[PDB]
Q: What sequence folds into this?
């Protein structure tokens, strides 16, 4: 009763960042999601600031890896034995699905593996790709594999980082068939069960759909599906974590406000467990004022009927 007032930050969509890959938000999208399970592990946080899944605070760390690399002889493939993000030993005993920031979708993520040799400060960088659907993608166990463009240049037992850039696809197969953003990796490898997951989300109220915060991942080869939808901007994760304002009901009613006109474009439900729904049926790219922003107006019940948008 009279708990610390909840709020969302005054930030435009274009001022914010995807919580599932280190790139800015571009737009808002809504569409039906009954066909598949929406259970991303990054960009998960309750409105009262409890981080969920594999969610951590800085967007730059999302889909990065750090550790030592071991060359798979007879190839240009390397196993990275993971370190903690601060370069300390990896501790797999935390009750989380995988290290915080681990990719939460199946896809071929291309980036660069960089390395510094401690003794002389010599450095090297090579194109590298991780396939998060690989049987040997096992970040929870502390190991992942990178395909690179070298078979001898990387030293073992030296600090090595993967910086993500974008995604790829096989141009010789059906275009935009991958990445598959709603398919979770098996974090401990093929045929292992994931643990400590943030739950799946779905609209339950008739006539409602999820509102997605959408970016376009860079493509590095082939014809990838570059759409990437998160449930919360990274800045909202950061803000809720910091504010830790108690939820007075299951749903915070937000209005998306247009400062150019003074009027509301649409309203939506921010669910306390950390996702947004709107009243719409069908696929729709929202056309928003670029200086528009979200504003918390009232706690409402979960069975509040939204104005259509």
A:
């Amino acid at each position: 009763t009279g708990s610390k007032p909840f709020s969302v930050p005054v930030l435009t969509v274009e001022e914010m960042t995807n919580s599932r890959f280190p790139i800015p938000l571009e737009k808002l999208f809504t569409g039906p999601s009954s066909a598949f399970v929406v259970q991303p592990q990054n960009g998960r946080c309750t409105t009262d600031g409890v981080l969920l899944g594999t969610t951590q605070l800085s967007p730059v760390n999302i889909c990065t890896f750090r550790g030592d690399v071991t060359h798979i002889t007879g190839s240009r493939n390397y196993t990275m034995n993971l370190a903690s993000q601060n370069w300390n030993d990896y501790d797999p005993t935390e009750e989380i699905p995988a290290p915080l920031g681990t990719p939460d979708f199946v896809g071929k993520i291309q980036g660069v593996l960089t390395q510094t040799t401690r003794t002389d400060g010599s450095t090297r960088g090579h194109k590298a790709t991780v396939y998060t659907g690989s049987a040997d993608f096992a970040p929870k166990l502390g190991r992942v594999q990178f395909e690179t463009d070298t078979d001898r240049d990387f030293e073992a037992n030296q600090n090595t980082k993967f910086t993500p850039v974008g995604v790829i696809q096989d141009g010789g197969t059906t275009h935009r068939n991958e990445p598959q953003q709603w398919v979770l990796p098996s974090y401990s490898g093929r045929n292992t069960h994931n643990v400590h997951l943030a739950p799946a989300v779905a609209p339950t109220f008739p006539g409602e759909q999820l509102l997605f915060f959408r970016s376009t991942m860079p493509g590095c080869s082939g014809y990838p599906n570059m759409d990437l939808d998160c449930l919360l901007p990274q800045e909202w994760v950061q803000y809720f974590y910091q504010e830790a304002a108690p939820a007075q009901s299951d749903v915070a009613l937000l209005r998306f406000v247009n400062p150019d006109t003074g009027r509301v474009l649409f309203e939506c439900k921010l669910h306390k467990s950390g996702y947004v729904t709107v009243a719409h049926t069908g696929q729709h790219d929202l056309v928003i004022p670029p200086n528009g922003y979200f504003r918390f107006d009232s706690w409402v019940n979960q069975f509040y009927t939204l104005a259509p948008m």
